[PDB]
Design a protein around this ligand. Structure first.
Ligand SMILES: O=C(O)c1ccc(COc2ccc3c(c2)CCC3)o1
Ligand SMILES: O=C(O)c1ccc(COc2ccc3c(c2)CCC3)o1
Lengths: 167, 167
C-alpha cells in the first residue's frame, strides 16, 4: 500500500513472484505481460471512491503481436488490451495484501470502438475499482491510445484462489 | 459455403489471406492463432437456426503461453480462449463471402469458471450465430476442455470494414 507507482523492472519482479511473494498474485512475464508501468495505484478515489489504477504500454512497430495479427494488416489484439485490464485488477488485489493465485472470472459488456496501430506511441489503461468481496474485485476499465478512448469494459472480475479443492 | 471442415494447413492459408482473398477476413498467424482445426461450419442449424462452428485447439505442455502465464502456475490465458471465439465469428463472415477486414467489436457477458492446464489434451469451441446485420455477426460461444465447459460468452460481435474513412 506504500508504493503508488511501479517501473517495468518492478512488474518483471512481480511476474517472478518476488513482489507479492510465491502463491500470491503474479503478472504474466513477456510475451503475455501487456503493461510497461503502473503510473498510479491507490485504494481511495477513482470513479467509485474504492481506488484506481493508471498504467501504460509503449507501442513500437516491432512488438511481436503486429506481425501475426494480421499479416499485411497489423493491429494490437483487442483480447490483449482486455487482458491488461484483468492483469491490473489482479495486481490491485495483490497490492492490497490478499493471498492466493489470480484468475480472470470475466466481464459484463466489452466494447472495441478503435484500434492500436504500429504507428501509435502509447496505450493507457484506466481501472476504477467498484467493489472488493473467495476474494474478488469488480472494476470498470478503459483502454486509450495517444489520448483517444478505444475500448471500455464494465464489470471486470478477478478472483484469488488460496484453495481449488472444492471447485 | 461448399467446404464444411478446415485443416490446420487451411487455417494457415487463411492467415496469409489466401483462403478468402486479400482485404478479406484473415485468421491470425501463430502465435495469435488459437485454433488448429474447424471440425464443422454451417449457415443453418445451431442454437438459433443461423449456423454454428465447432473448432479445436490441441494442448501440450510446450505451448508458448504456459511458460509466461504464469511462472510456476501455468494456465492458458482466458483472453486467448475468448479471442478464438472472435477469430471463429470473423472466419464465419469471411466463409459467407463478405468482403473486408475483420475486427472484434466486443461481447456481452463473459464468464471464466474453469481453466486449461498443460495436462489438458484438447480445447473445443462451440459458436452459435445469433444474427448477421457495416457487416457484423452476433454470436454466443462456449470454450470446453476435454468435455468440460469452462467459459461462456453472450453477444460476441465481429465486424468487417471495407472503408474506415468515416470512423
Ligand atoms: O483484435 C481485434 O480484433 C481488434 C482489435 C481492435 C479492434 C477494434 O477494431 C476497430 C474497431 C472500430 C474501428 C476500427 C477498428 C477502425 C474503424 C473504427 O478489434
Ligand atoms: O487468464 C486467466 O486469468 C484465466 C484463465 C482461466 C481463468 C479462470 O480460472 C479459473 C476459474 C475458476 C476456477 C479455477 C480457475 C480453478 C478453480 C475454479 O482465468
Amino acid at each position: 500500500t506504500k508504493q503508488h507507482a511501479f517501473t517495468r523492472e518492478d512488474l518483471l519482479r512481480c511476474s517472478r513472484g518476488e513482489l507479492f511473494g510465491p502463491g500470491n498474485a503474479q503478472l504474466p512475464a513477456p510475451n503475455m505481460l501487456m503493461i510497461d508501468r503502473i503510473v498510479h495505484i491507490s485504494d481511495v478515489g477513482g470513479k467509485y471512491g474504492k481506488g484506481e489504477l493508471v498504467a501504460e504500454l509503449d507501442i513500437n512497430p516491432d512488438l511481436w503481436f503486429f506481425a501475426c495479427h494480421f499479416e499485411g494488416d497489423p493491429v494490437m489484439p483487442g483480447c490483449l488490451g482486455l487482458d491488461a485490464m484483468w492483469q491490473l485488477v489482479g495486481f490491485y488485489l495483490g497490492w492490497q495484501g490478499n493471498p492466493g493465485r489470480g484468475r480472470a472470472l470475466g466481464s459484463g459488456e466489452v466494447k472495441f470502438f478503435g484500434q492500436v496501430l504500429p504507428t501509435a506511441k502509447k496505450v493507457t489503461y484506466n481501472i476504477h475499482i467498484k467493489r472488493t468481496i473467495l476474494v474478488l474485485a469488480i472494476a470498470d476499465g478503459t483502454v486509450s491510445v495517444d489520448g483517444r478512448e478505444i475500448y471500455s469494459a464494465e464489470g471486470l472480475r478477478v478472483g484469488l484462489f488460496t484453495s481449488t479443492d472444492s471447485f
